[PDB]
Design a protein around this nucleic acid. Structure first.
Ligand SMILES: O=C(O)CCC(=O)C(=O)O
Ligand SMILES: [Mn+2]
Length: 202
DNA sequence: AGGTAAAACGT
DNA sequence: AACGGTATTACCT
């Protein structure tokens, strides 16, 4: 059974690419470090984040923003690694979105206990562009709901190499990650990473 | 008028 | 511990 209208899970899709993806996460973060962002209301998120590409997701006192500049370094986010871009395009194509041109990649790092509460990915300049979401490392339980917060959730374990793609009818669906269990993975040791690809600009 | 914060405590 | 309240408003443009 597929995930939803316009949505699919490509299990272990990124497994072969994962070692290089992780090397390139480390390179990105060497330039724009992982940081735990603070919400407009003043709470520090448990997931640590950075970005690459032309636009990075950030919080600010005034809201959420896709920005061309990393507010911590005052420099552009690092260029999107070719490994990231190539994996993203292969996964998008396999999922039925062959024309996707991301300009933004949000890199999440989950330590044990870290979560991401149910939310919608908002800001869609192209209603035909999906979200491509790549899991690395330790396993996590992903929630995928509907257009309204109380719509029933599907709960899916996401393991190393899994890729989730949503878009079209499901582009604005609520989703999140449950608190990460401690464990070991040979390539990330003690964390999970996620890559979220978007077209956030015109 | 219409979008966005809550991507964040009690039962 | 899964579910849902809260934004049932206060601000911006
Ligand atoms: O880590 C995940 O699988 C989900 C990440 C996410 O929803 C986000 O960064 O917007
Ligand atoms: Mn998201």
């Amino acid at each position: 059974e597929p995930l939803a209208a316009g949505a699919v899970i490509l299990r272990r899709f990124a497994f072969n690419a994962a070692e290089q993806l992780i090397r390139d996460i480390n390179d990105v973060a060497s330039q724009s470090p992982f940081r735990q962002m603070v919400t407009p209301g003043g709470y520090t998120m448990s997931v640590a984040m950075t970005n690459c590409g032309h636009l990075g997701w950030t919080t600010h006192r005034q809201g959420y923003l896709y920005s061309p500049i990393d507010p911590q370094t005052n420099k552009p986010w690092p260029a999107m690694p070719q490994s990231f871009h190539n994996l993203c395009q292969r996964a998008a194509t396999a999922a039925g979105y062959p024309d996707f041109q991301p300009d933004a990649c949000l890199i999440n790092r989950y330590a044990p206990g870290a979560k991401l509460c149910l939310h919608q990915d908002k800001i869609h300049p192209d209603l035909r562009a999906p979200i491509v979401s790549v899991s690395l490392g330790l396993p996590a339980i992903f929630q995928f709901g509907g257009l309204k917060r109380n719509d029933p959730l599907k709960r899916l374990l996401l393991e190393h190499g899994d890729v989730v793609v949503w878009g079209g009818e499901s582009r604005l669906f609520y989703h999140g990650i449950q608190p990460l269990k401690a464990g070991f993975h040979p390539l990330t040791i003690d964390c999970r990473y996620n890559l979220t690809f978007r077209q956030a600009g015109k």
